[PDB]
Amino acid sequence: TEQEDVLAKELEDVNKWGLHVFRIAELSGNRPLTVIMHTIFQERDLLKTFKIPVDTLITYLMTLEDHYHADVAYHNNIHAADVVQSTHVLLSTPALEAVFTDLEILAAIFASAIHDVDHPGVSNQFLINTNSELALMYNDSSVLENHHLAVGFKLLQEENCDIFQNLTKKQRQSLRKMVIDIVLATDMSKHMNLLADLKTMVETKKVTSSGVLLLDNYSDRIQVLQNMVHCADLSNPTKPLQLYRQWTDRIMEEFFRQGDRERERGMEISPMCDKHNASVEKSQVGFIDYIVHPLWETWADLVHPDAQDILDTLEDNREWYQSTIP
Numbered sequence: 001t002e003q004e005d006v007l008a009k010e011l012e013d014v015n016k017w018g019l020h021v022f023r024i025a026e027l028s029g030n031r032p033l034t035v036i037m038h039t040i041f042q043e044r045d046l047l048k049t050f051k052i053p054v055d056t057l058i059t060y061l062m063t064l065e066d067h068y069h070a071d072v073a074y075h076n077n078i079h080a081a082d083v084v085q086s087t088h089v090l091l092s093t094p095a096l097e098a099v100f101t102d103l104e105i106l107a108a109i110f111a112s113a114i115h116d117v118d119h120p121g122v123s124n125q126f127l128i129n130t131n132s133e134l135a136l137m138y139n140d141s142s143v144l145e146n147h148h149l150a151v152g153f154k155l156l157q158e159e160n161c162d163i164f165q166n167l168t169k170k171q172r173q174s175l176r177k178m179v180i181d182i183v184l185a186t187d188m189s190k191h192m193n194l195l196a197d198l199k200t201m202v203e204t205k206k207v208t209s210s211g212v213l214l215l216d217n218y219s220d221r222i223q224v225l226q227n228m229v230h231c232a233d234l235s236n237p238t239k240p241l242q243l244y245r246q247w248t249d250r251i252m253e254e255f256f257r258q259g260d261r262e263r264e265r266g267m268e269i270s271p272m273c274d275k276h277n278a279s280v281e282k283s284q285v286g287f288i289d290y291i292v293h294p295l296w297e298t299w300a301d302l303v304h305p306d307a308q309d310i311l312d313t314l315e316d317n318r319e320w321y322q323s324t325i326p
Ligand SMILES: O=C(Nc1c(Cl)cncc1Cl)c1ccc(OC(F)F)c(OCC2CC2)c1
Pocket: 186, 187, 188, 233, 234, 236, 237, 244, 246, 247, 248, 249, 251, 272, 283, 284, 287
């Protein structure tokens, strides 16, 4: 059909920053995560490398995708698909050429795919404050992140869903550990510590004559993978403005809904969650200035000058958002 043709054409941009992820979600019948992951696995030859039967991969991906909530404005399957594709582009950075093994690539992409699965559309602090079952289960630490991992891994046990069935035991153990390490690092409470280590690595960085990163031990390798997926999670303001604005609309809708739940429970409304007292534009500029730009500038230094175009777009978007403030 014409719909399948236009979808295949859009997917030809899977290696490009600024892929039309919203259009892909529409064209695929709300299956962005499944089609984008499948495309990336085929692009990186991951099915042959890890002997993943195609039917098993699709069955797992559709099940995973079904566990993202369709009524959650931001933390849904579109965001998952976007973080996956963004990580995939970051892994292709010339400064990281041949740095990571196929197993580490698989871990980073899989981690990205499951990193927000079964997100209820409310924050860790909300879950802690409402004496939730999730916060009780996880003792108030990385509540959501622990849950995303548990669900992502548990779904591998469903019928014909074990995409890692042909990995050796050692490969499965290593991948599991890396995935856990990466997803737990998406908790924003760890942002400052991740960034400080990223800066430390930038200052003591070792490279080949072509500017390729030399990372020997697990500690440094996982730190870069952690920061890579963290960057992807925080990549919305670095995308073409048309995409960024859609992400902003979605995060604000999700935040406002949490604020609506807090208001009716008599709780103090969380920062930026009050629809009656919001400054969307100022908050985006502050978000860029204090979180997104410091992180991306540091990432850019690590892979210099490979991330220059991403940094340029971020600064363009910050300038535009600032111009909307009288
Ligand atoms: O925190 C975010 N994401 C997030 C991450 Cl990266 C990790 N863990 C939880 C969340 Cl909510 C997140 C994602 C996108 C945002 O806006 C735009 F880019 F869409 C945004 O605006 C902040 C702002 C209004 C004060 C915030």
